[PDB]
């Protein structure tokens, strides 16, 4: 059986587009080299929160570059975008110790169904 170790908590916490746009950025502002291992895990979600489940044709062995990603984005499987984004950020945050989760949004004003 699989389970947490310290304590998997959520508290109705979700990652919005804003959080992502920031996370993906931090992954570029870093001057450290974690390894192609993570560089892929970050791309797997991106394509998952933008395109969805790996629906592309499997690349050829010779194409190590592609094959590397395919296995990254493929792993996800039927992972929904809503979750994909949460996974992407959840990672970038793991690398960086300090992070001000500024989750803000405006209610805006919808329009009513009216025609001339």
């Amino acid at each position: 059986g699989s389970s947490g170790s310290s304590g998997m908590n959520r508290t109705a916490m979700r990652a919005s587009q804003k959080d992502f746009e920031n996370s993906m950025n931090q992954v570029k502002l870093l001057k450290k080299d974690p390894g192609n291992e993570v560089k892929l895990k970050l791309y797997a979600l991106y394509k998952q929160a933008t395109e969805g489940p790996c629906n592309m044709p499997k690349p050829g062995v010779f194409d190590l570059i592609n094959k590397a990603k395919w296995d990254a984005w493929n792993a996800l499987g039927s992972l929904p975008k809503e979750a994909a984004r949460q996974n992407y950020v959840d990672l970038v945050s793991s690398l960086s110790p300090s992070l001000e989760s500024s989750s803000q949004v405006e209610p805006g004003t919808d329009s009513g169904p009216s025609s001339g």
Side-chain angles (χ1 to χ4, degrees):
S2 57
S3 284
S5 177
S6 183
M8 276 301 128
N9 76 78
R10 196 195 287 287
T11 312
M13 202 281 186
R14 298 86 81 81
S16 206
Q17 182 69 106
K18 198 89 157 75
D19 210 28
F20 189 103
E21 273 172 59
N22 287 294
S23 289
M24 52 150 225
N25 193 28
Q26 288 175 272
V27 174
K28 305 185 187 273
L29 282 325
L30 62 79
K31 275 78 163 295
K32 275 210 150 272
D33 42 287
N36 271 61
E37 89 175 282
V38 46
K39 273 88 157 54
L40 290 159
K41 92 192 296 168
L42 270 305
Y43 148 92
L45 283 319
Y46 167 75
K47 298 286 272 179
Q48 199 88 19
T50 52
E51 314 281 61
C54 168
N55 85 110
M56 44 171 306
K58 193 157 169 278
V61 286
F62 291 93
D63 275 301
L64 311 172
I65 297 302
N66 295 262
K67 205 73 156 47
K69 270 87 182 159
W70 200 83
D71 277 298
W73 184 15
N74 170 28
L76 283 278
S78 193
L79 197 298
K81 318 210 169 89
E82 293 283 290
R85 274 199 205 159
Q86 181 71 89
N87 290 281
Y88 188 117
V89 291
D90 155 79
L91 187 281
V92 180
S93 205
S94 189
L95 294 159
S96 277
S98 194
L99 210 170
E100 194 150 69
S101 277
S102 74
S103 195
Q104 285 79 25
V105 41
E106 274 187 313
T109 304
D110 204 35
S111 174
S114 199
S115 199

